């Protein structure tokens, strides 16, 4: 019985046709591209957002235009009650849930000496606690054989980024969550993995990329990209949202069936 | 220029149509399935073998039957001259090389006190040195934007397998090779990664699976599979060659473009 | 080509003494959180035996904390206890202010206080998640913050992680494991910032260690271990979790902490030190 | 429910002495490969200072080896040099037999000998690969094998790795890095086997350390570093590779080796200990 092949042989194993995915914080940035790409691959997508209402509506319309159904659901991951409600709403929209991408997140910088309890809590509540409860509700609502992909960062393991303990720590915790949740969620045949991107061009990158660059405060946007391209990748280019979306789709497919409890680094070979 | 999208948006990014791949030790086991699956996804495949002539010929025929071209080439990876010859022959057969899967390998068990220089050398010459020179020749012959996938094992990082220092060490070195080669080979835009499978049902698994099981010398083949399924995976099943082939195809496609210098564990969440 | 042969420069200066004196903690002052019992208690005891004056922090175990202080004094060192709950930042701030007043300085800070929890991810409540993270992660973070502010230049900060931070086979453990996993990242990041005061920051990651905590939940780490006797539990821990065939003890951890706290640990910073007798979990 | 409260059992026995004596190496015998110079020389020197009688192995540096032996004796401990090339298994076997004849027993073995190499993967020849792997990997493996056979019950085996085993940004370094990365796996796997004689097996992973090797190739780790003066190279190493802002020294590694070799390292086995001042390479 253990000789049975799981899923189809050939390219069909990469297909996401007919699947239903939910992506947190899909109104913009990496989450937006995850939504777009899952859609291009045949998924109906639930676009979650907390603040970016108009942007979320635009993503939903873009997904439909590409040939897949989509809908948006407002929910703040810092509020568990919101997460619970979002999932209940989500399953009524398309009738089921096959894939959940926990992507929502915020960044923070500051020397450990200057960190306040309020800032620590702000970051942990969204990045760690928020992902945990999105994971909890995903387990309850996911189809047998489903998928849960959490959002980490190269910072979980990075050794040279100063004034970054809070954000880095909020992300490192996700790697442990993946290993432990992969055990529990396997009782519904759900795989649990964490993607760990390097710097990726989004609103977050624009806001804080210079903080990762010694003496980079006065660099132009052009110099910033040149630095990210040369310093963080032997491939000599900047990371883009699609670079992450592609890996998420692999994990979400039958091709990622034997990949569970893992951290997948997607940083172009960066050393940080 | 840093805003340019690398490759196609959508499912086409997972396509291997028109690519040419070379797989070492493709006459049987994991290498055979890699060759078969790469062929199913559109690759013309060079089926390398060292001893399994008839099996290699069967794989080539099956690939052609499935709709793709293939050819087998003999080469013992323990002889660098053989590796050099194989790559020269490969490019003559198909004109180019896009993907190289360094798969060939041998297993070994023995308490450290009993390991002989001959056994150590036998294992390292094939598993470590062999992979290193297959990688060197791959770099020389690969198309710009090519792919190199090396074969590691859960043993590179495993913490409870006794009498296994030689084999485990030969595989652990591969993880470092992936990180270092990713830097060098990036000058030709080639990504370099290592897949690390847990136990997979093959001839190798049949020969030594019991060695990974305390007091498993007398277990029936049925009990061995049951042990592997329950002990090594929360998903409760045994790993199969297709589980690995699928991940190799992902890495070999445009979807794996930003994944370089990484170790991808494919063990169903095993703890060993 | 730069042909000049190697030369002794300013970077050739030896940090600290050569020989066994490099392992000495004589004259140092250490603060250990949750030192009234368990691993924290042994850290305090051993640090005391090696010459440190110790600040024994406790949150509830008042009597045990007084016992530890008395034992350290009896052994030949000075000690004092300070009550503070790490789930309250104001308590941590006050603890450190009182601490430096006691002996005049702080050389070593061992962030040890913690709580354990088990539960399938599906059953975890926000209150339980918060209970664990507030003590194990947030608590250690602010103990670290205050430690940085009060520590002598060249000081030492040792955080308490666990084998669970990296463990792959413990079911129903994501909350506790995640709270400890975050500590490994903190060690790497804090080692950078705190180096501006020449302070090293590392995290010790113990496997199972015989304490009140181990007593309470060791069976949770053992498949079908609910009905195992205390003796059977120890035998299991000894054989299953260590090729060395014995159970981990508080002294096993305290010894490594003393190494990191000494001059011998000067070049070890931003690291995770596993102390589990070679366990695979 | 098992209601019997925690009590002492056979597994509660304290391994070794409580207090500072646990760090003592007094009366121990240690063997260090490649101890005529560099890191190996300092391991031998420091081990000697802490009370060990030392077997100083060398392959070529005869005079240097003799100087180390004389210095250890002058410092108060006995020592003797033994010539053996780790690329020849027969030499290794002979070296261990001679070592036990000299001092009667062997408590600690430090596998330190190594060579470095640089080259883009495209240019690496089988001879170069074999040259590096025969000494750094195969050599260390057979030194470990013989060490297991001759070491005292409760002994110590410390292998020499490098930050390169895990490094992510050093170009043209696959061969050397790989030869060192294999050592980390060896530590995990040998810790299991060797535990049958209560021997702990660990690997130390240094960052750049000022020695003849560092002097020879440090510029290779520095982009556009070919024309930097010796002073400039040290300044770069100090600032780029450590938040602590100084260069790593042989004594930095020797101290950690002494800790691992002592009773304090008793519960530390199958581990990789990074000693690089918090470097990111
Ligand atoms: N960009 C980079 O370089 C990297 C990013 N990451 C991680 O990837 C994820 C996305 O990053 P990126 O796209 O750059 O981020 P942006 O800052 O561009 O936006 C991120 C998303 O997080 C959402 N979000 C924030 N708070 C909440 C909340 N309370 N509830 C629900 N959703 C929320 C935002 O939605 P809204 O508009 O509605 O507020 C937005 O959709 C994050 O978790 C980030 O930490 C990891 C590595 C690198
Ligand atoms: N099965 C498992 O559980 C796991 C396997 N792996 C690794 O995956 C790879 C394949 O494993 P698996 O299929 O199980 O192995 P098998 O033993 O079934 O077959 C292995 C392959 O290695 C080839 N090979 C052996 N020696 C040479 C040589 N000198 N030159 C060229 N090719 C050679 C063999 O070809 P030929 O017949 O022609 O000699 C064969 O094709 C190996 O590297 C293995 O270590 C890693 C983790 C787990
Ligand atoms: N035992 C084991 O096997 C392992 C333990 N660890 C970690 O080591 C540390 C100590 O474990 P162990 O000694 O076994 O634990 P115990 O349960 O025996 O007691 C731990 C200590 O934590 C203290 N503490 C708890 N909450 C607080 C608080 N809010 N404020 C201040 N102090 C507090 C307790 O003091 P009080 O009585 O005053 O409340 C007690 O002194 C923990 O962080 C634990 O997670 C890691 C790996 C293994
Ligand atoms: N210096 C650094 O920055 C770092 C060094 N390391 C590792 O630490 C170890 C020592 O480095 P370092 O002291 O700088 O090296 P050096 O080049 O200064 O000398 C190293 C030692 O290796 C010995 N050796 C070389 N070949 C053999 C052989 N075939 N048989 C026996 N002994 C041999 C040499 O002895 P002889 O003179 O007799 O030939 C010498 O004693 C090496 O394994 C190295 O890879 C790791 C990280 C960093
Ligand atoms: O999480 C990371 C990791 C690395 C990195 C480099 C540049 C800019 C940004 C990042 N982020 C968020 C924004
Ligand atoms: O390399 C590994 C890892 C794990 C494992 C489990 C069972 C059988 C076999 C393995 N192998 C080879 C054969
Ligand atoms: O944190 C850990 C890791 C391993 C372990 C094994 C047994 C008992 C206990 C543990 N703990 C806490 C109590
Ligand atoms: O092995 C390593 C790692 C790092 C490093 C930095 C500088 C100089 C040298 C090293 N070596 C050998 C010589």
Please summarize what this structure is.
4 copies of one chain form a homotetramer. With 272 residues, chain A is α/β, with parallel strands linked by helices.
Structure write-up:
The structure is a homotetramer. Chain A has 272 residues and is an alpha/beta fold. Chain A has a single domain (1-272), classed as 3-Layer(aba) Sandwich (Rossmann fold), CATH 3.40.50. Chain A is 42% helix and 13% strand. Chain A contains eight helices and seven strands, in the order E-H-E-H-E-H-E-H-E-H-E-H-H-H-E. The first copy, chain A, has helices at 29-40, 53-65, 80-94, 117-141, 165-185, 203-208, 221-231, 241-252, and strands at 20-23, 44-49, 70-74, 99-102, 147-151, 191-197, 263-266. Chain A has a seven-stranded parallel sheet, with helices on both faces. In chain A, helix 4 links the parallel strand 4 and strand 5 (147-151). In chain A, helix 1 (29-40) runs parallel beside helix 2, helix 3 runs parallel beside helix 4 (117-141) and helix 4 (117-141) runs parallel beside helix 5. The longest helix of chain A is centred in the middle third of the chain and has 25 residues, at 117-141. Chain A is globular. The interface between C and D is large, with 70 and 72 residues.
List the SSEs and their pairings:
The structure is a homotetramer.
Chain A (H helix, E strand, L loop, with lengths): L19 E4 L5 H12 L3 E6 L3 H13 L4 E5 L5 H15 L4 E4 L14 H25 L5 E5 L13 H21 L5 E7 L5 H6 L12 H11 L9 H12 L10 E4 L6
Parallel strand pairs in A: 1-2, 1-4, 2-3, 4-5, 5-6, 6-7
